[PDB]
Amino acid sequence: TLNGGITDMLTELANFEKNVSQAIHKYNAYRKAASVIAKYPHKIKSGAEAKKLPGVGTKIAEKIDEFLATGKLRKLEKIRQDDTSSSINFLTRVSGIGPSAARKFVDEGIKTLEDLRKNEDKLNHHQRIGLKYFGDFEKRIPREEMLQMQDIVLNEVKKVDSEYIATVCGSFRRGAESSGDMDVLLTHPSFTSESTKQPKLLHQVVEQLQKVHFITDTLSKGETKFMGVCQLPSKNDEKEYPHRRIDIRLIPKDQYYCGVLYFTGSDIFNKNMRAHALEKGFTINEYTIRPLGVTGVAGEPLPVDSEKDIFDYIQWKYREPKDRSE
DNA sequence: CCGACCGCGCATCAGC
DNA sequence: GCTGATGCGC
DNA sequence: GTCGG
Ligand SMILES: Nc1nc2c([nH]c(=O)n2[C@H]2C[C@H](O)[C@@H](COP(=O)(O)OP(=O)(O)OP(=O)(O)O)O2)c(=O)[nH]1
Ligand SMILES: [Ca+2]
Ligand SMILES: [Ca+2]
Ligand SMILES: [Ca+2]
């Protein structure tokens, strides 16, 4: 965190553009600059020094000069004073409340945690659960708890069908000492790109995890993606563990490497890598990497036997998960 | 100067 | 009910 | 907000 002051500033600007302005390209511009600066191995001395980095342009260089001189950014000091922006920014921290709903809630005079808690009937299901665990979802998960959580998920999945493979991805797979939440990649041989020889594959796993009281709430659920809430068991007289967010993604078994690349991230890493894919005439998603024809139409799925094959196609040296934390 | 900015699953809703 | 757009999220 | 063409 050589440049923590700067990257914090940029992230707050990023958050303003997403939540308030609803300017997603600006949000992404700010996040990209923050990311490139975060890995830059020097304490930055000027906006000019920063503008050398890709993604840092004229306007952010100016802000970095202002920040270095004064320790502050006038633009942000103002945003912080503005009640409508403060309220919107607050409300979007509830899972399920995005920029649009936040602004609509403010319009109706719902703008504090108390307001939310007295108007539960104005929330959809996701939002109500996001509100219920507002505090818990703020907390990070120690790797040691992630490890206990992995063990429960892996062993319960095995009890359902020993042919399931469950892989914990996200920042955990990147080696992080703490994680925002748990991400499980699920495969089963019955579900391939060619056929689905077995229904309820995700359901069965979700039910078993609910049965043992690991999964406690559901935010959304379909055939291939679960988004919900889980909690470690606690011992006699112990305070309960906080509730945690969990995502489970069922991916065609033959498309595992594209899936685990996607689910391992980071999100900014994924965005960067997919952009680069396009520059190189490929398109990457969680299933496949395909060539872009002479017109911009995706061709057939290229063969993939490893994460490295994907990097190879786009002429990137292989990067271990622990170095994908952009 | 300006087009393009990654890709997609689930929930909600409007129109038909 | 279906379809397509939008919101929110990974 | 930034960048390549
Ligand atoms: N292609 C793409 N992938 C994304 C996006 N957002 C996003 O989270 N992903 C991927 C990469 C992430 O590592 C993975 C899991 O999301 P996550 O919110 O749990 O993030 P994480 O594990 O890296 O980090 P964290 O929980 O410690 O905060 O989903 C996106 O916008 N585009
Ligand atoms: Ca995570
Ligand atoms: Ca997650
Ligand atoms: Ca995230």
Residues of chain A (48-67) having a beta carbon less than 7 angstroms from strand D:
53-61
A283 is in an annotated binding site: no
Residue that the structure tokens 């809630």 belong to: A105
In angstroms, the CA A290 to CA A179 distance is 31
Q: How far apart are the first and last CA of chain A?
A: 13
Active site residue: A63, A72, A118, A235, which one?
A63
- Beta-strand (E) ranges in chain A? 141-142, 165-168, 178-179, 182-187, 215-221, 225-230, 244-250, 282-284, 289-291
Which tokens is A323 given?
A: 């170095």
Distant-in-sequence, close-in-space partners of A60: CB < 8 Å, separation ≥ 6: A10, A30, A33, A47, A50, A51
Query: Which of strand D's nucleotides are less than 7 A from any protein C-beta?
Result: 1-4
Q: Of A287, A264, A243, nearest to A168 (Cα)? A: A264
Distant-in-sequence, close-in-space partners of A185: CB < 8 Å, separation ≥ 6: A166, A167, A168, A169, A249, A251, A256, A259, A260, A263
Within 13 Å and on the Cβ side, how many CA atoms surround A209? Answer: 30
Query: Which of strand C's nucleotides are less than 7 A from any protein C-beta?
Result: 6-10
A63 labelled catalytic:
yes
Whether ligand 1 lies within 6 angstroms of the CB of A55 is answered as no
The answer to whether the beta carbon of residue A126 comes closer than 7 angstroms to any atom of strand B is yes
Q: In chain A, how long is the greatest CA-to-CA distance?
A: 66
In angstroms, the CA A185 to CA A183 distance is 7
Q: Of A276, A256, A264, A260, nearest to A317 (Cα)? A: A276
Phi, psi of A146, deg, nearest 5:
-55, -40
Distant-in-sequence, close-in-space partners of A50: CB < 8 Å, separation ≥ 6: A6, A37, A40, A44, A56, A60, A61, A64
- Cβ atoms of A185 and A167 within 8 Å: the answer is yes
A171 is in an annotated binding site: yes
- Cβ atoms of A303 and A309 within 8 Å: the answer is yes
**Closest Cα to atom 20 of ligand 1:** A170
* Ligand 4 centroid, distance to A171 Cα (angstroms): 10
Which tokens is A145 given?
A: 């708890």
Question: Residues at the strand C interface (CB under 7 A)?
Answer: A 92, 94-102, 130, 170, 181, 183, 227, 245, 247, 267
Experimental determination approach used? X-ray
* Resolution reading in Å: 2.0
In angstroms, the CA A153 to CA A173 distance is 15
In angstroms, the CA A13 to CA A74 distance is 12
CA pseudo-torsion sign A295, A28, A85, A68: negative
A92 is in an annotated binding site: yes
Å between A292 CA and B2 C1'?
A: 23
Which ligand 1 atom lies nearest to the CA of residue A172? Answer: 22
In angstroms, the CA A184 to CA A166 distance is 6
Domains of chain A as residue ranges with CATH: 1-82 (1.10.150.110), 83-139 (1.10.150.20), 140-262 (3.30.460.10), 263-325 (3.30.210.10)
A115 is in an annotated binding site: no
- Cβ atoms of A302 and A313 within 8 Å: the answer is yes
Residues of chain A (284-303) having a beta carbon less than 7 angstroms from strand B:
284-287
In angstroms, the CA A138 to CA A131 distance is 11
Give the length of chain A: 326
* Ligand 1 centroid, distance to A182 Cα (angstroms): 10
**Closest Cα to atom 28 of ligand 1:** A180
Which ligand 1 atom lies nearest to the CA of residue A171? Answer: 22
